[PDB]
Design a protein around this ligand. Structure first.
Ligand SMILES: Nc1ncnc2c1ncn2[C@@H]1O[C@H](COP(=O)(O)OP(=O)(O)O)[C@@H](O)[C@H]1O
Ligand SMILES: [Ca+2]
Ligand SMILES: [Ca+2]
Ligand SMILES: [Ca+2]
Ligand SMILES: [Ca+2]
Ligand SMILES: [Ca+2]
Ligand SMILES: [Ca+2]
Ligand SMILES: [Ca+2]
Ligand SMILES: [Ca+2]
Ligand SMILES: [Ca+2]
Lengths: 372, 720
């Protein structure tokens, strides 16, 4: 009768809600804001730290810190603040009578996995918990069981091939290039037009500019020649102090770090070579449906024209007899939460729950054996 | 089995006896006769016995004997000489390995007196080297204003001053020491010479340290000693530039004039790199500190090289150079960077000019603009079909339907009766003798929502793993079934209802007036889907079933196959009703008032025609979203989701090729698709009419001739 909670803790956003629902109830960015100026007016409502949307609404006077940097968790006290905020303030529910499903990127360090257990049974005292791979939840949310998932969020970008509902560990690939790196690259290349953005609040503004006014060019050199020859690609954006900036070719140069990582100085290959080498390390008979079931997940796959560019690049690399289908659902920003929400609400799921009893007879090592 | 012609092998194995050889510095010497039967403990031996047989042939036997103190070269040479002596013979010999103290009993049998061993032996032919060893301790003073040069100075603190720069070379560590009063150019020359000594003399197996006054490391203070007070430094004038200008003499050695010739090329450095001709041999004489470089060309004769070495050795005693002078022999492309400093702008062949370019290790697609040829469409129709589904599908199966968050079994009287808005799992057992086996099908309806299809996938994976992983899965959507899945019900049609269960509404009640459309392919697999009951939804190729709460109607068009009529009457027995067998063109008024309409259903003369099993209608997708324009097939029969809004579509019906464009399809897609459709018409193998008409169809405005080929048209599919 108790409703389970699903809490996808990404690097940039937290998507939390109840199992069985179609949409996550609370979506808020995973930041901790602390004051950096001198408070002169007494009384009032000054707090030592602000979490979530309250930190976004007051970000002009706050320094902002992300607890998660490139997937791994650096600060655990701030992550406990994030979990306390999403339990008590957003979902407004007591977590000692709801089992909680958590998500995790693959090829993570193992020391996080028991440590995520080490808070959840000791501070919040959940009755049960489970850790699931994000890519298999994205594949389940599409209604598929075999396919390759390109999951790209704010911290990492990983290709995971899944056959018969199980990820193949010898072909999962990780690329440390995602939305925060594209935001930093866009801060770097907006200095060419004379705009300076160095503050973390200005980093949030440039992230908003990247969300509103960026797209993937179908071919890079012809689009650069088009942007050089005219001004039809220029767009204007209004800063919150009323200043209007104009961006031209920088609309499409910032997604191109996904396909050419050498812009930010990385020797590693693009996402299409990563998908091709991830497919090539699988067995010969199952390569037919991996090319035909290529789903995309995460917020960084939300640019216009990313699927056409991906099909163009994979088609040039694959043999010509193969059939290529890049699958881009419109709900792919929250596909991890939808797969977790359906997977937690099943009546056949209530024996894979890691309850309190086996945890406190087994210690913080039960998560390495029950969560595959 | 290449033979060898060693001259001592000619006396081996010609008369019956016993022959012994000893290895001395990669060669065999036969030991004398009265030294037979005894061996040195630090040498290697080759033993031969040849034996005459009764039948006339002459057998052979090789042994090779190794002592416990022999080196690697002696034992290896003994093994290789044993192999080569077998190859000199016609492979008729057997080889044995003999170790000192562990000999075979047959090896003891050859010698009459026995085996006795002495200490000592001949020395090994190897000379000892260590891989990657340098033992170097030198010191260089670099000095100058314009013409900066390096000069070797003895390793002491008294050789140092404050106005020059110094390079202390200690093998794997190179220390660069810059004076306080040193200028810009000799610092740059010190850096250049230090990086040259690292990357060329030592091939990068070194580390260059840069130091100044007060920051000397422990290595320099350990080698040189405690640091005295430095005796300042003279200001860099122009007289020592002239002194650096007169340090080397470049000479030529060449037999191009038909005789011996040692002639002066230059005595003024910086020299020209082009002066080093490739057909001759040149000599640089920086012999004040004791260096003479002999530079050999690639196209120089051998006597020129020996004459150059002889002349360089003759320069030792003539000009009275000190007795440590090194004659360094340098080929082309292998020059020491102490040789390179006397030349104006030395150019290695793979240098970077300007800023240079990066390699980037990864490239994007730059495919050439080829025009696409449409004749590859109807030709090369490769198809894989099934791999293990050879049975006709009687079997033993279990069908589950997903409601909410749990699956239930369906009723066993209702196998082939699915709901369009639900999701199903079908477990199937092979009775076939091909090692049995199990198939799990995951059927997903078109009207089914996200929660049902996600739960169907998760329960499909769970049902696969809890049976041990032996069954294989197959995701299937509505309209795209394989032939084996249609054969699971045993000649029955697949009945698809409208509506289904949900988490908030439960099972939907069926409508009072229900209309059913029956299709059958060329093979015989047959569907019967529920459609909304209007008079305009009738297809003249098809068989339709009308269920009213007064009576029932079975309407047959002129294009209906017999499988469609059998599926229609099977659906009548499913719905428990008795039809009256309505035919096309002879409909009663009761049928038309049951539909609530009069006329204007889907009619074309191609849909009138009976013959369609031999010629299926073929649907094609035209796009240029990968940059190159491609037409592809779509497998399976025709529904809404095959029609892509962003792409152009072609339908071939053997008498009229439909071209269908979306709302947001590009116009060059349309025009070059028209040309591709035309070229597809002329290139077909069975000759057809060249004036087959091309009709352009817009999205939302389709004629019934186009619509009638689609199973279950929805008018409000694209409209939100
Ligand atoms: N419309 C958009 N266009 C481009 N990028 C977007 C868009 N919406 C979100 N993003 C990026 O997606 C990232 C977060 O994606 P998501 O995977 O949903 O969260 P998380 O990475 O925290 O799991 C953000 O860094 C944001 O920059
Ligand atoms: Ca994520
Ligand atoms: Ca020896
Ligand atoms: Ca032999
Ligand atoms: Ca000087
Ligand atoms: Ca010559
Ligand atoms: Ca439903
Ligand atoms: Ca299996
Ligand atoms: Ca038919
Ligand atoms: Ca298109």
């Amino acid at each position: 009768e108790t409703t389970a909670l699903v809490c996808d803790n990404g690097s940039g956003l937290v998507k939390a809600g109840f199992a069985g629902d179609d949409a996550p109830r609370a979506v808020f960015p995973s930041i901790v804001g602390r004051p950096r100026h001198q408070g002169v007016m007494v009384g009032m409502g000054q707090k030592d730290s602000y979490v979530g949307d309250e930190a976004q609404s007051k970000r002009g006077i706050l320094t902002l810190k992300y607890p998660i940097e490139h997937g791994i968790i650096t600060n655990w006290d701030d992550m406990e603040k994030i979990w306390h905020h999403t339990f008590y303030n957003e979902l407004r529910v007591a977590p000692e009578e709801h089992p909680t499903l958590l998500t995790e990127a693959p090829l993570n360090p193992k020391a996080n996995r028991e440590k995520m257990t080490q808070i959840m049974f000791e501070t919040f005292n959940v009755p049960a918990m489970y850790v699931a791979i994000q890519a298999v939840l994205s594949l389940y949310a599409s209604g598929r069981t075999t396919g390759i998932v390109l999951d790209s969020g704010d911290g990492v970008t990983h290709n995971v091939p899944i056959y018969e509902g199980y990820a193949l560990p010898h072909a999962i690939m990780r690329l440390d290039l995602a939305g925060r790196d594209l935001t930093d690259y866009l801060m770097k290349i907006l200095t060419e037009r004379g705009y300076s953005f160095v503050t973390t609040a200005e980093r949030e503004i440039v992230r908003d500019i990247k969300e509103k006014l960026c797209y993937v060019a179908l071919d890079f050199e012809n689009e650069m020649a088009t942007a050089a020859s005219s001004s039809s690609l220029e767009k204007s954006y209004e800063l919150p102090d009323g200043q209007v900036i104009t961006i031209g070719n920088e609309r499409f140069r910032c997604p191109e770090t996904l396909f050419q990582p050498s812009f930010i100085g990385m020797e590693s290959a693009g996402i299409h070579e990563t998908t091709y080498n991830s497919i090539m390390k699988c067995d010969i008979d199952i390569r037919k449906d991996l090319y035909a079931n290529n789903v995309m997940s995460g917020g960084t796959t939300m640019y216009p024209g990313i699927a056409d560019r991906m099909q163009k690049e994979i088609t040039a690399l694959a043999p010509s007899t193969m059939k290529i289908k890049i699958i881009a659902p419109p709900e792919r920003k929250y596909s991890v939460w939808i797969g977790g929400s359906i997977l937690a609400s099943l009546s056949t799921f209530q024996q894979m729950w890691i309850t309190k009893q086996e945890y406190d007879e087994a210690g913080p090592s039960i998560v390495h054996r029950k969560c595959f | 089995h290449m033979v060898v012609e060693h001259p001592e092998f000619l006396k081996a194995g010609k008369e019956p006896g016993l022959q012994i050889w000893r290895v001395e510095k990669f060669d065999l010497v036969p030991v004398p006769t009265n030294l037979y039967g005894d061996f040195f403990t630090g040498d290697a031996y080759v033993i031969l016995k040849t034996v005459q047989l009764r039948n006339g042939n002459l057998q052979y036997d090789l042994h090779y004997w190794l002592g416990n103190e022999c080196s690697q070269d002696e034992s290896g040479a003994a093994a290789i000489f044993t192999v080569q002596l077998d190859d000199y013979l016609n492979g008729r010999a057997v080889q044995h390995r003999e170790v000192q103290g562990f000999e075979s009993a047959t090896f003891l049998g050859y010698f009459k007196s026995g085996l006795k061993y002495k200490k000592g032996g001949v020395a090994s032919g190897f000379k000892h080297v260590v891989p990657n060893e340098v033992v170097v301790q030198r010191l260089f003073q670099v000095k100058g204003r314009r013409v900066v040069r390096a000069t070797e100075v003895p390793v002491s603190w008294e050789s140092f001053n404050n106005g020059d720069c110094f390079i202390l070379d200690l093998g794997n560590n190179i220390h660069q020491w810059c004076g306080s009063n040193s200028n810009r150019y000799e610092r740059l020359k010190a850096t250049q010479v230090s990086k040259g000594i690292r990357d060329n003399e030592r091939s990068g197996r070194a580390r260059v340290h840069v130091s100044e006054e007060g920051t000397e490391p422990e290595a320099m203070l350990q080698v040189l000693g405690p640091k005295p007070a430095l005796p300042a430094g003279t200001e860099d004038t122009a007289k020592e530039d002239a002194a650096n200008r007169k340090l080397a003499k470049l000479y030529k050695v060449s037999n191009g004039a038909g005789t011996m010739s040692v002639s002066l090329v230059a005595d003024e450095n910086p020299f020209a790199q082009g002066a080093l001709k490739s057909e001759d041999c040149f000599i640089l004489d920086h012999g004040k500190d004791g260096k003479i470089f002999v530079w050999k060309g690639k196209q120089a004769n051998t006597e020129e090289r020996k004459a150059a070495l002889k002349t360089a050795s003759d320069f030792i005693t003539k000009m009275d150079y000190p007795k440590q002078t090194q004659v360094s022999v340098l080929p082309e492309g292998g020059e020491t960077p102490l040789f390179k400093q006397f030349f104006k702008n030395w150019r290695d062949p793979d240098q970077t000019d300007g800023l240079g370019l990066s390699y980037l290790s990864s490239h994007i697609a730059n495919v050439e603009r080829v025009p696409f040829d449409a004749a590859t469409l109807h030709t090369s129709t490769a198809m894989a079909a099934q791999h293990g589904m050879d049975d006709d599908g009687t079997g033993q199966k279990q069908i589950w339907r997903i409601e909410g968050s749990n699956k239930v079994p369906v009723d066993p009287a209702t196998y082939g009766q699915f709901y369009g808005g639900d999701s199903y799992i079908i477990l199937y057992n092979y009775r076939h003798g091909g090692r049995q086996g199990q198939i799990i099908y995951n059927w997903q309806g078109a009207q089914s929502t996200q929660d049902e299809v996600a739960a169907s996938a998760i329960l499909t994976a769970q049902l696969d793993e809890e049976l041990g992983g032996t069954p294989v899965q197959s995701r299937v959507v509505q309209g795209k079934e394989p032939a084996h899945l249609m054969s699971l019900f045993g000649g029955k049609p697949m009945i698809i209802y409208k509506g289904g269960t949900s988490r908030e509404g439960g099972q939907t009640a069926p409508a009072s007036t229900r209309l059913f459309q029956v299709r059958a392919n060329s093979a015989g697999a047959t569907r019967a889907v529920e459609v909304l009951p209007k008079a305009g939804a009738l297809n003249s190729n098809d068989a339709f079933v009308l269920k009213t709460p007064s009576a029932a109607y079975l309407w047959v068009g002129t294009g209906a196959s017999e499988a469609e009529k059998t599926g229609a009457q099977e659906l009548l027995r499913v719905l428990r009703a008795q039809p009256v067998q309505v035919a096309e063109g002879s409909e009663p008024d009761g049928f038309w008032e049951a539909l609530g309409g009069k006329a204007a259903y889907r009619t074309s003369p191609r849909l009138k025609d009976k013959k369609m099993d031999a010629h299926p209608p073929r649907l094609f997708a035209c796009s240029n979203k990968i940059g190159r324009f491609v037409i592809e097939e779509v497998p399976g029969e025709l529904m809404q989701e095959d029609l892509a809004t962003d792409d152009v579509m072609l339908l071939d019906t053997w008498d009229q090729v439909f071209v269908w464009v979306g709302k947001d399809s590009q116009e060059e897609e349309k025009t070059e698709a028209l040309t591709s459709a035309k070229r597809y018409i002329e290139t077909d193998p069975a000759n057809r009419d060249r004036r087959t008409p091309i009709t352009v169809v817009k999205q939302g405005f389709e004629p019934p001739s186009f619509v009638g080929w689609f199973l279950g048209w929805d008018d409000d599919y694209w409209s939100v």
